[PDB]
Amino acid sequence: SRGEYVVAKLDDLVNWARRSSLWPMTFGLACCAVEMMHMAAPRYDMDRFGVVFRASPRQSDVMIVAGTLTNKMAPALRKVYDQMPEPRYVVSMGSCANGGGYYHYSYSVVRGCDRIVPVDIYVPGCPPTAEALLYGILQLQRKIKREKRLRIWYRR
Amino acid sequence: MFMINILSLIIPILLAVAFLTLVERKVLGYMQLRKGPNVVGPYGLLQPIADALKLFTKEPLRPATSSISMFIIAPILALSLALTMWVPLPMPYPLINMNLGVLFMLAMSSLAVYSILWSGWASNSKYALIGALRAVAQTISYEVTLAIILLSVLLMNGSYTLSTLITTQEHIWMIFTSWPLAMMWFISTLAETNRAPFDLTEGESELVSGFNVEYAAGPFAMFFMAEYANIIMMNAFTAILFLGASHDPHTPELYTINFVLKTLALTITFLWIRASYPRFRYDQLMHLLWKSFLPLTLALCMWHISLPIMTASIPPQS
Amino acid sequence: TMYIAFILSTIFVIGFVGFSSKPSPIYGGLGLIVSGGVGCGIVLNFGGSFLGLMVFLIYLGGMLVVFGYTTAMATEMYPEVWVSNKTVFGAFVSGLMMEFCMVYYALKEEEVEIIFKFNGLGDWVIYDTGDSGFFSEEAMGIAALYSYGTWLVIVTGWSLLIGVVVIMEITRGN
Amino acid sequence: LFQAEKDRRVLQMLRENLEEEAIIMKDVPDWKVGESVFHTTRWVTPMMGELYGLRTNEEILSATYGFIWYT
Amino acid sequence: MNIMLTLLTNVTLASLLVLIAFWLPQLNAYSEKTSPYECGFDPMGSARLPFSMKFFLVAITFLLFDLEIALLLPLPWASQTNNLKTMLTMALFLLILLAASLAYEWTQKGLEWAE
Amino acid sequence: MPLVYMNIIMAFAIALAGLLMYRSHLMSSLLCLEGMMLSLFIMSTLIILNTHFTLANMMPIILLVFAACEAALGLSLLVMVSNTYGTDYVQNLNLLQC
Amino acid sequence: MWFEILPGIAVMAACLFIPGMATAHIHKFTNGGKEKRVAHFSYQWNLMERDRCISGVNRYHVTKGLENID
Amino acid sequence: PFFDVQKRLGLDLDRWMTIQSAEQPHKIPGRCHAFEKEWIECAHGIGGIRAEKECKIEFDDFVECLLRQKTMKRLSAIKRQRDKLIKEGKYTPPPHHLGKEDPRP
Amino acid sequence: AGRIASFLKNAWAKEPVLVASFAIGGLAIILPSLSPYTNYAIRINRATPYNYPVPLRDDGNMPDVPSHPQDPQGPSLEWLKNL
Numbered sequence A: 001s002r003g004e005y006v007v008a009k010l011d012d013l014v015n016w017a018r019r020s021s022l023w024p025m026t027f028g029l030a031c032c033a034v035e036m037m038h039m040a041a042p043r044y045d046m047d048r049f050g051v052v053f054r055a056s057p058r059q060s061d062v063m064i065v066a067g068t069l070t071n072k073m074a075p076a077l078r079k080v081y082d083q084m085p086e087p088r089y090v091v092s093m094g095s096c097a098n099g100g101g102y103y104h105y106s107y108s109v110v111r112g113c114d115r116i117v118p119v120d121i122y123v124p125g126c127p128p129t130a131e132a133l134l135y136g137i138l139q140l141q142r143k144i145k146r147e148k149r150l151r152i153w154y155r156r
Numbered sequence B: 001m002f003m004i005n006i007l008s009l010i011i012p013i014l015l016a017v018a019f020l021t022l023v024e025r026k027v028l029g030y031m032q033l034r035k036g037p038n039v040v041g042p043y044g045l046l047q048p049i050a051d052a053l054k055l056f057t058k059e060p061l062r063p064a065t066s067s068i069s070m071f072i073i074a075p076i077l078a079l080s081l082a083l084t085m086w087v088p089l090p091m092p093y094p095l096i097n098m099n100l101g102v103l104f105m106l107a108m109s110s111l112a113v114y115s116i117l118w119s120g121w122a123s124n125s126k127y128a129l130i131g132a133l134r135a136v137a138q139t140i141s142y143e144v145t146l147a148i149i150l151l152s153v154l155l156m157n158g159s160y161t162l163s164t165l166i167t168t169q170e171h172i173w174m175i176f177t178s179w180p181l182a183m184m185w186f187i188s189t190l191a192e193t194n195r196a197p198f199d200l201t202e203g204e205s206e207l208v209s210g211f212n213v214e215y216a217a218g219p220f221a222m223f224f225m226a227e228y229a230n231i232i233m234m235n236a237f238t239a240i241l242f243l244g245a246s247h248d249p250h251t252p253e254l255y256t257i258n259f260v261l262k263t264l265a266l267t268i269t270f271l272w273i274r275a276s277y278p279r280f281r282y283d284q285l286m287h288l289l290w291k292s293f294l295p296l297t298l299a300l301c302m303w304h305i306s307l308p309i310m311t312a313s314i315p316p317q318s
Numbered sequence C: 001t002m003y004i005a006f007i008l009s010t011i012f013v014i015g016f017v018g019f020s021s022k023p024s025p026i027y028g029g030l031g032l033i034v035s036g037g038v039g040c041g042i043v044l045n046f047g048g049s050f051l052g053l054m055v056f057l058i059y060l061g062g063m064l065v066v067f068g069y070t071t072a073m074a075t076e077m078y079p080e081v082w083v084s085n086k087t088v089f090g091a092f093v094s095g096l097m098m099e100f101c102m103v104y105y106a107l108k109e110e111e112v113e114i115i116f117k118f119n120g121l122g123d124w125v126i127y128d129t130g131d132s133g134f135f136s137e138e139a140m141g142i143a144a145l146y147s148y149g150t151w152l153v154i155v156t157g158w159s160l161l162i163g164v165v166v167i168m169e170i171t172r173g174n
Numbered sequence D: 001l002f003q004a005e006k007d008r009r010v011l012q013m014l015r016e017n018l019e020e021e022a023i024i025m026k027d028v029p030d031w032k033v034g035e036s037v038f039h040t041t042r043w044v045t046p047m048m049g050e051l052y053g054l055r056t057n058e059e060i061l062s063a064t065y066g067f068i069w070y071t
Numbered sequence E: 001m002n003i004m005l006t007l008l009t010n011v012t013l014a015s016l017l018v019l020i021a022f023w024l025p026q027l028n029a030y031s032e033k034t035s036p037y038e039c040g041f042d043p044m045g046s047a048r049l050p051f052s053m054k055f056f057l058v059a060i061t062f063l064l065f066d067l068e069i070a071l072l073l074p075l076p077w078a079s080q081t082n083n084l085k086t087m088l089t090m091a092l093f094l095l096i097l098l099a100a101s102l103a104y105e106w107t108q109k110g111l112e113w114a115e
Numbered sequence F: 001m002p003l004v005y006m007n008i009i010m011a012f013a014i015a016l017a018g019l020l021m022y023r024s025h026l027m028s029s030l031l032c033l034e035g036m037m038l039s040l041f042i043m044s045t046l047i048i049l050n051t052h053f054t055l056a057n058m059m060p061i062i063l064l065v066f067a068a069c070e071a072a073l074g075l076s077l078l079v080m081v082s083n084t085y086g087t088d089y090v091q092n093l094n095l096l097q098c
Numbered sequence G: 001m002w003f004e005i006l007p008g009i010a011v012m013a014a015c016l017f018i019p020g021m022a023t024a025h026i027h028k029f030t031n032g033g034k035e036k037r038v039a040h041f042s043y044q045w046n047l048m049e050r051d052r053c054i055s056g057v058n059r060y061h062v063t064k065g066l067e068n069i070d
Numbered sequence H: 001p002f003f004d005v006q007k008r009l010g011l012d013l014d015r016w017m018t019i020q021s022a023e024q025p026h027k028i029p030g031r032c033h034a035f036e037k038e039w040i041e042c043a044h045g046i047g048g049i050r051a052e053k054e055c056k057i058e059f060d061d062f063v064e065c066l067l068r069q070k071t072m073k074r075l076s077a078i079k080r081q082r083d084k085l086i087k088e089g090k091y092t093p094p095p096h097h098l099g100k101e102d103p104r105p
Numbered sequence I: 001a002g003r004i005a006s007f008l009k010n011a012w013a014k015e016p017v018l019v020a021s022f023a024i025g026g027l028a029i030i031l032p033s034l035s036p037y038t039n040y041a042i043r044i045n046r047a048t049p050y051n052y053p054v055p056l057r058d059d060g061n062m063p064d065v066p067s068h069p070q071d072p073q074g075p076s077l078e079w080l081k082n083l
């Protein structure tokens, strides 16, 4: 149908922009954030793909939870996630962010950042290499490529 | 046809702003041993389009503590004045030919000051307030120094008309004539446009996005467009003021090519400086102009008052 | 006609009504900036481009300091806006109503105030037919501050230097 | 040359304004056509509305604002 | 006229960009999203409290120096007069008095910020 | 007199009435005082430009100079009052009585 | 390599060409193939108004000459 | 009250700016230079009382040139009468007043 | 002279900006009173004809006033032509 074709093209265009312009919030917790710096480094330059760190959560699209999430830190992470406007995505990085990690059976560690925020991508490793994190970012981009919001709305 | 001329002045400026964003990305990357955006399009040519679409399709939010009226007006004022600053520029023919073309630019810059102040105050947050007051101090210093420097340089010209600037620089360059004022003017234009090392109103390392901390999506993109348009406009003003291009009335496109090349060189120098230097402290910026530039600016103003009189080289009034 | 100067004068009075109703120094400075720009427009239409640009630039610089001072000295928990307070809104509405009544009476008939007599006709009518040539009369008169007006320059410079000394002495404390 | 042209143009505009005033203010009880507002008989320059008073808005606007609005 | 049309065009374009920004995207606002940002933790006080200005004297001196630049601006036309000696004397007098003001404030420590 | 002069004089009168009617802040009254001089500047330049009084064109600039000198004086007094009391409220200026 | 920056700079330069060239072409189009008349002073404005008056078509850029005086 | 130091010492501090018929730059004339000259030459040397009593004609002409009140009254009267006449169709403006003419150069 | 030399050496090592500023200001104050082209600038400003040269009524006793612009009497700008 003409309307179906129009909405398909429009949300192909919309998903392309969001996929190609990703702005992670400048947010790192532990040793996993060093591999974020090495992904930002010249070797695996993240700025090629349109992935740029922004300090303010208002101007951020993705939250890369890279490090251990503690009980004393969970409210701040939830606060910045809430203050991030939509559409927003979450990439947990490393064992600590995925589940508990080396500190799973601890009194002061949250066993998974997905207990706090909805996580879109999980990156495995301790720490995941910069290439592993880049693969996770590209996988997030491909996940964005498949979103059909206007197509869902047209048939709604 | 005047509306067509307005559109032909506005739309290419916005396109050049977007591609200046791209160029700054790539230049900083290559100076930092990276490549910069080269994935979104061929050599990363669709990156500005992707960024604009993402920003204008993302949700904007007004903070619960904000004053909504001045929260919305500030990006409007910033972008409106950034676009308005271009109308008296002769390239080689101004869109609007003014008798006092420089005082209009000074007044419009001083008005464009208030966009960041009102956005910082309206946001109702401590980082925004700090950014606004840093803007206040920066504007104080750069405003006084810029006013006196422009007075001297135009005193070498004879009037406040930029076409008269072209006629003055028909033979040699104001950079050859008055290079110390040119250096101080370049520093003052950096401060006016809030570029490194004077990017203190929005200092990421110290403040979390500074005055535009609460701004997101479309309103933020307007602040970015206003900043980059101001960068290009100030570099164009510097090129017209100090690097005068030869003008042929029957083929004016040559002046356009020369002027565009000089403006691009100055803008790339801006990006180069940002890549090279650290950031000032705003008290040190105030002490830089007041305690160093201001005495030398006054001495050079006296010298450029005296010089045409003692050498019988006073420019024509018209 | 096009009543450009009259419309600008009305906007000037509206900005005055605002910053005189005095919501809070932020919005008072906003209204004063608007009034300065509109007065620049008025005197540009009347002929003085240098004077209009100068008053606009001077008041833009002056309201910058006022903003920094009201952020530090003249701020409260809930800064007042025109609709926030009953007194401020009352003064604002009173000024607007008085201005509208004066404008309506002046447009409908030759309104004679208790102080002055005002005729409802063209600001273009009141102008002069003659013209200057190859120079600006306003620019020449202003530039005459140095050839003529040596005394004015002396007293003005002395006043500015004494003002610097004074502001240093007032804020000395101790 | 321009001074002579300006004088002739001003005098012609004043004369045709006077003719139209004679046509218009004919039934007015107490009205003298062409009466001066000055005690002196010395020539006084027309102000702006003595020339472009009974003329079109385009002409009036051009005469009163064309130079200032030309940019 | 032309300048008014240009200003109206620029303001209309900026307002249209704002209107597109606030109506085109999908909106979803709640209390936590619109709360003030203080790096993840609730602000202790309010942003409308007094904010000490340690360069208060420099702002007043800036007002006076803005007056000085306003006085100095008509110099390009003033240099077209026949009384060049008087004009030069007055211009140098104004600039020397401005320099004296700057030197006096500098020596009396008015350019230093409050601690 | 045209209606432009009426509007400028009305603006001066409004700014004068604002100054004479304090609310709480001294800064607001300082802003009202600054507006009166803006109206004076506009009126003076409208009068001078209309009568082609060429040598009088320098008067409005001197007017602005002494305007901002008065503004500087008011700001200095305001900072001293604010240091003394914590607020720029005119209610605290009540130690002296008539 | 560093020459991959050039296409973006080329696009920016091409964008910056449009305003000035467009203004020049529009001025030549609306002034009869000649430069737009600069009137910084009342003398020049009066010259333009006289050109409008003597043209007979209400366009100052329509210039007349010896064939018009005789 | 008034210590005429300028007159005593032969100085000129503000008398150059007191009136609009004095020496102006580039010999730019005032709007009412002739009327001010006539009034000043009438009132010179006779004092304020006699100047107000006897030079009232010159002063009235000067004020009329300055403010243009009688001229505006005449113009408004003519405009009102013309508008009333054209309201009832009793007056037809000439083509040269309607914009269908070739003015003088 | 020794004290002056020591002061200049110390200032040039501590405040070169201020030394340059004061030197430029002093040269701006002093040089115009010595240059022989100040009077040339005054003459060039005088020679500029902003307004119309209203002619004088000939009384028959004006030998220094030209009858035609190209007559030898009257001011000459031959000095300005070769300058």
Ligand SMILES: COC1=C(OC)C(=O)C(C/C=C(\C)CC/C=C(/C)CC/C=C(\C)CC/C=C(/C)CC/C=C(\C)CC/C=C(\C)CC/C=C(/C)CC/C=C(/C)CC/C=C(\C)CCC=C(C)C)=C(C)C1=O
Pocket (backbone or CB within 6 Å): A025, A026, A027, A028, A029, A033, A036, A037, A040, A041, A047, A052, A053, B011, B014, B015, B017, B018, B021, B024, B025, B028, B048, B049, B051, B052, B055, B221, B224, B225
């Ligand atoms: C907190 O712990 C920490 C971390 O965390 C865990 C860290 O990581 C690090 C490590 C730190 C680093 C690695 C440093 C940061 C990394 C970097 C790479 C720094 C480099 C920074 C930059 C390169 C700056 C880039 C920033 C931004 C925001 C660029 C984004 C671009 C924009 C916002 C521009 C968008 C706006 C645009 C494009 C405007 C254009 C829009 C328009 C609408 C214009 C078009 C208008 C028109 C009218 C055109 C229409 C015309 C048409 C249709 C016709 C034209 C004709 C045709 C033919 C088409 C540290 C130290 C740390 O301590």
Ligand SMILES: CCCCCCCCCCCCCCCCCC(=O)OC[C@H](COP(=O)([O-])OCC[N+](C)(C)C)OC(=O)CCCCCCCCCCCCCCCCC
Pocket (backbone or CB within 6 Å): E016, E019, E020, E023, E024, E025, E026, E027
């Ligand atoms: C104030 C500005 C005035 C001038 C505007 C000039 C044109 C502006 C051009 C820019 C438009 C920017 C938005 C682009 C489109 C995307 C957003 C969009 O579609 O928004 C539309 C909005 C969309 O509503 P929304 O609030 O759901 O918007 C969110 C939209 N999505 C989901 C896409 C994010 O439409 C409406 O608000 C109205 C919908 C129909 C209901 C009509 C109610 C009655 C009132 C209006 C109809 C006329 C009544 C006549 C009779 C009156 C008397 C009884």
Ligand SMILES: CCCCCCCCCCCCCCCCC[C@@H](O)O[C@H](CO[C@H](O)CCCCCCCCCCCCCCC)COP(=O)(O)OCC[N+](C)(C)C
Pocket (backbone or CB within 6 Å): A009, A010, A012, A013, A016, B039, B046, B048, B049, B052, B053
């Ligand atoms: C700037 C001012 C606003 C502009 C308004 C819009 C103007 C036109 C917008 C420009 C559209 C650009 C489209 C770019 C196409 C993407 C190129 C191509 O590579 O994309 C492919 C296809 O993309 C998607 O299938 C759809 C892309 C968009 C399709 C076009 C939709 C219609 C656009 C034209 C209509 C514009 C007018 C209507 C809106 C105003 C998939 O690539 P991708 O997998 O990701 O790359 C992975 C990286 N690799 C290769 C290294 C691995």
Ligand SMILES: CCCCCCCCCCCCCCCCC[C@@H](O)O[C@H](CO[C@H](O)CCCCCCCCCCCCCCC)COP(=O)(O)OCC[N+](C)(C)C
Pocket (backbone or CB within 6 Å): C147, C148, C150, C151, C154, C155, C158, E083, E085, E086, E089, E093, H011, H012, H013, H023
């Ligand atoms: C010395 C007396 C001390 C006791 C009294 C103190 C009073 C204050 C100090 C007053 C000193 C100045 C008084 C003399 C003013 C001169 C005014 C004018 O007549 O002289 C000018 C000559 O000026 C000279 O160049 C020197 C002027 C003075 C230079 C500055 C010295 C004053 C410094 C004051 C310091 C601040 C103290 C003042 C406030 C207390 C005019 O020259 P000219 O070119 O023909 O004018 C052209 C006009 N045309 C076009 C019609 C022909």
Ligand SMILES: CCCCCCCC/C=C/CCCCCCCC(=O)OC[C@H](COP(=O)(O)OCCN)OC(=O)CCCCCCC/C=C/CCCCCCCC
Pocket (backbone or CB within 6 Å): B175, B180, B181, B182, B183, B184, B186, B187, B197, B238, B242, B273, B277, B292, B293, B296, B303, I014, I015, I017, I020, I024
């Ligand atoms: C038009 C294009 C111009 C291009 C020029 C660009 C230059 C390179 C750009 C990179 C610099 C940009 C970032 C740098 C920002 C900071 C710059 C800076 O610091 O300079 C100020 C610098 C720092 O001072 P401090 O080290 O803090 O010492 C304080 C002592 N108490 O000091 C200055 O003010 C330098 C001022 C330069 C003015 C030029 C000097 C004048 C030379 C005098 C000779 C001319 C005399 C004229 C009379 C001639 C008579 C015949």
Ligand SMILES: CCCCCCCC/C=C\CCCCCCCC(=O)O[C@H](COC(=O)CCCCCCC/C=C/CCCCCCCC)COP(=O)(O)OCCN
Pocket (backbone or CB within 6 Å): B294, B295, B296, B298, B299, E096, E099, E100, E102, E103, E106, E107, I011, I014, I015, I018, I019, I020, I021, I022, I023, I024, I025, I026, I029
């Ligand atoms: C007099 C004719 C010139 C007219 C005015 C000149 C133009 C304007 C210059 C005046 C502006 C203000 C000057 C202020 C002077 C005193 C300021 C001061 O306090 O300086 C001190 C004192 O330092 C000094 O050394 C005083 C300056 C001495 C320089 C004066 C030398 C005079 C030179 C005369 C000509 C010599 C020619 C040499 C040529 C060399 C090559 C150019 C240092 O400041 P700090 O507090 O230490 O900095 C902050 C630290 N936290």
Ligand SMILES: CCCCCCCCCCCCCCCCCC(=O)OC[C@H](COP(=O)(O)OCCN)OC(=O)CCCCCCCCCCCCCCCCC
Pocket (backbone or CB within 6 Å): A010, A014, A149, A150, A152, A153, A156, B052, B053, B056, B057, E020, E024, E025, E026
């Ligand atoms: C040649 C003639 C012209 C040809 C092209 C014509 C169209 C051009 C584009 C016009 C502007 C967009 C028009 C509206 C697009 C559809 C929007 C829509 O219907 O969105 C509905 C839906 C909302 O969500 P829903 O599924 O309803 O579920 C409720 C959520 N719990 O889903 C959403 O809201 C999804 C979120 C995004 C919606 C906004 C973006 C839509 C696409 C805009 C593309 C252009 C962007 C331009 C930006 C400004 C310029 C830079």
Ligand code: SF4
Pocket (backbone or CB within 6 Å): A030, A031, A032, A066, A067, A068, A093, A094, A095, A096, A097, A101, A102, A125, A126, A127, A128
């Ligand atoms: S997963 Fe490993 S590398 Fe990452 S934060 Fe935990 S301990 Fe550090």
